[PDB]
From Swiss-Prot:
Protein name in UniProt: Lamin-B1
Family to which this protein belongs: Belongs to the intermediate filament family.
UniProt domain LTD: residue ranges: 12-119
Subunit and partners: Homodimer. Lamin dimers then assemble into dimeric head-to-tail polymers. Ultimately, two head-to-tail polymers assemble laterally into a protofilament with a uniformly shaped rod of 3.5 nm in diameter. Interacts with SPAG4 and SEPT12.
UniProt disease link: Leukodystrophy, demyelinating, adult-onset, autosomal dominant, typical: A slowly progressive and fatal demyelinating leukodystrophy, presenting in the fourth or fifth decade of life. Clinically characterized by early autonomic abnormalities, pyramidal and cerebellar dysfunction, and symmetric demyelination of the CNS. It differs from multiple sclerosis and other demyelinating disorders in that neuropathology shows preservation of oligodendroglia in the presence of subtotal demyelination and lack of astrogliosis.
Compartments, as annotated in UniProt: Nucleus lamina
Species, as recorded: Homo sapiens (Human)
Whole-protein residues included: 439 to 549 of 586
Post-translational modification note: B-type lamins undergo a series of modifications, such as farnesylation and phosphorylation. Increased phosphorylation of the lamins occurs before envelope disintegration and probably plays a role in regulating lamin associations.
Residues modified as Phosphoserine: 107
Length: 122
């Protein structure tokens, strides 16, 4: 029942959540692997308070060793969807007044890691 083509590749990498923006504009991921990792199409689930929303990636860039990638939630001003970082064109700036929690799941739904902010004043 082939309504789409197949392709065997490890769409995954040693990416870690470096830091989340204190104002609540963007989420910064950080690939600290030994080799250039292919993103493929991961899904980042951004929780925060009451409800939550996820974002899927696309195959247009490879994560080099030490390469960071920033997800700007719509309201950024920067060019929409680099060549350098990525803009969440489905969800606007959330404001991390509520401790935001980012869930990193691979292209096939399986989970690598999950991290949140720290309860502090601003």
């Amino acid at each position: 029942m082939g309504h789409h083509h197949h392709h065997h590749s490890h769409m995954t990498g040693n990416v870690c959540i470096e830091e989340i923006d204190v104002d609540g504009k963007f989420i910064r991921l950080k690939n600290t692997s030994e080799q250039d990792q292919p993103m493929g199409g991961w899904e980042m689930i951004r929780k925060i308070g009451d409800t939550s929303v996820s974002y899927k990636y696309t195959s247009r860039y490879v994560l080099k060793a030490g390469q960071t990638v920033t997800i700007w939630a719509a309201n950024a001003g920067v060019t929409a969807s680099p060549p350098t970082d990525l803009i969440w064109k489905n969800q606007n700036s959330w404001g991390t007044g509520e401790d935001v929690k980012v869930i990193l799941k691979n292209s096939q739904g399986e989970e690598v890691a999950q991290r949140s902010t720290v309860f502090k004043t601003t």
